[PDB]
């Protein structure tokens, strides 16, 4: 199979650049429209990361920063699959995540929220999807937190995630939320997304059968990236 270009990104399935409800976007959004280009090798290629560079606890946010004890919070496991838009599994993709602790406090110099810091929690991890596009990490469920958009704004509990896969065109960063969180319906950031179905594509579902007795709960969350079309006639990529 000789591959062609990635299918066009559907701008309607993503938040626009300018979203007045999310204040900081007013000055950090281009006024000109994006210029669409036909893809070249630059866009269809991407870096490769070897597994032996990852530590054994890189995907375990409960233990990778634990010093004197275990972090305080809700023990949860998150797993799912990464596929391309045509349903093909995404193999060996780099998945990076970061979150706040159970108080909704980030281990970041710029975070002075009164929510308490956890000396045994770092808030970041990473992994590579297997041959089936499967991924899995363990962590503490992040707490929601206040922020200044409108004075009493609150972000629902969420986990930030980033993916670097087979093509640069696939580069993506986003956030997923937890099923049932009531703050979801009021979040200005989540509302930058036009459709309701897309908003729901960011909610991790409770996976009760995969709970581990007297230990951890589990959530299922799948990710879909742009996919490449196969070429059967002219090959203009180069």
């Amino acid at each position: 199979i000789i591959w062609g270009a990635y299918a066009q990104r559907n701008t309607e399935d993503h938040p626009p650049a300018y979203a007045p409800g999310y204040k900081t976007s007013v000055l950090r959004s281009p006024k000109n429209a994006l210029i669409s280009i036909a893809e070249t090798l630059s866009e269809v290629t991407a870096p490769h990361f070897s597994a032996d560079k990852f530590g054994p606890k890189d995907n375990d946010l409960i233990l990778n920063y634990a010093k004197d004890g275990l972090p305080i919070g809700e023990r949860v496991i998150v797993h799912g699959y990464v596929r391309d838009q045509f349903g093909r599994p995404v193999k060996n993709a780099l998945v990076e995540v970061w979150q706040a602790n159970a108080s909704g406090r980030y281990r970041h110099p710029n975070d002075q929220y009164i929510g308490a810091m956890d000396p045994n929690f770092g808030g970041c991890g990473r992994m590579l999807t297997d041959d089936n596009g499967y991924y899995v990490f363990r962590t503490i469920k992040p707490g929601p937190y206040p922020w200044r958009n409108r004075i009493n704004e609150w972000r629902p509990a969420h986990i930030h995630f980033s993916l670097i896969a087979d093509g640069w065109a696939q580069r993506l960063i986003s956030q997923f939320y937890f099923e049932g969180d009531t703050l979801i319906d009021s979040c200005p950031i989540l509302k930058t997304i036009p459709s309701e179905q897309q908003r729901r594509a960011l909610i991790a579902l409770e996976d009760k059968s995969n709970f581990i007795e007297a230990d951890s709960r589990c959530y299922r969350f799948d990710i879909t990236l742009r996919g490449r079309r196969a070429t059967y006639f002219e090959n203009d990529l180069t």
């Binding site: 959004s29 281009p30 210029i35 290629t45 991407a46 870096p47 490769h48 930030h160 989540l190």
Partner: protein
């Protein structure tokens, strides 16, 4: 037909998960950085630097940047590269960095990329693909960095010529300049207003 997972801003603390060191967090033994040159990497070393400005001409102090480029011979360290040529075995081709919390400057130590083949047997001028992530930015902004001492190649570049507003092409050309003995290319990104940098939907 499945839909692509929707994008969301990286947020103000995008450094916790992508640059733990800069956040003063040490959890990983091997950390990813902005230095793409190894001991035996081929090509002429260059430093890429600049700042990102908002609609008020103020630099973003919380922005995150990544670049993707070919080796000195215009070959990408990627299985997706179909040139049939051998790639520099000591070149990742990718790097990540964050602007300084105080000044806002960002930089990468890399190599000047060689010309890459374009579509339909054309040749692209040397360039580096760059993406921007930050609070206020809902979707990573894509752009390209070309070099001013490569004017003859740029004039024939397919992508640059696909911009009908010729006057905007210059926003994608970094200016070379020899510091003590190191070659530095200055590339400032303007998200809004006058001389707004061209952004692509790739």
């Amino acid at each position: 037909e499945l839909k692509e997972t929707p994008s969301q801003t990286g947020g103000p603390y995008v450094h916790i998960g992508l640059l733990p060191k800069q956040a003063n967090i040490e959890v990983f033994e091997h950390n990813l950085d902005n230095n793409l040159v190894q001991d035996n990497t081929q090509g002429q070393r260059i430093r890429l630097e600049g700042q990102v400005f908002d609609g008020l001409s103020l630099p973003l102090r919380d922005v995150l940047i990544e670049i993707w480029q070919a080796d000195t011979n215009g070959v990408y360290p990627s299985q997706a590269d179909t040139q049939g040529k051998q790639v520099d075995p000591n070149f990742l081709g990718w790097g990540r960095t964050g602007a300084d919390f105080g000044t806002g400057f960002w930089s990468f130590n890399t190599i000047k990329p060689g010309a890459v083949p374009g579509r339909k047997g054309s040749t692209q001028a040397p360039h580096i693909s760059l993406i921007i992530f930050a609070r206020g930015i809902n979707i990573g902004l894509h752009t390209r960095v070309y070099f001013d001492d490569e004017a003859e190649a740029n004039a024939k570049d397919p992508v640059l010529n696909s911009i009908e507003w010729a006057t905007r092409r210059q926003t994608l050309v970094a200016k070379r300049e020899e510091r003590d003995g190191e070659v530095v290319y200055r590339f400032d990104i303007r998200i809004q207003g006058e001389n707004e940098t061209v952004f692509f939907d790739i």
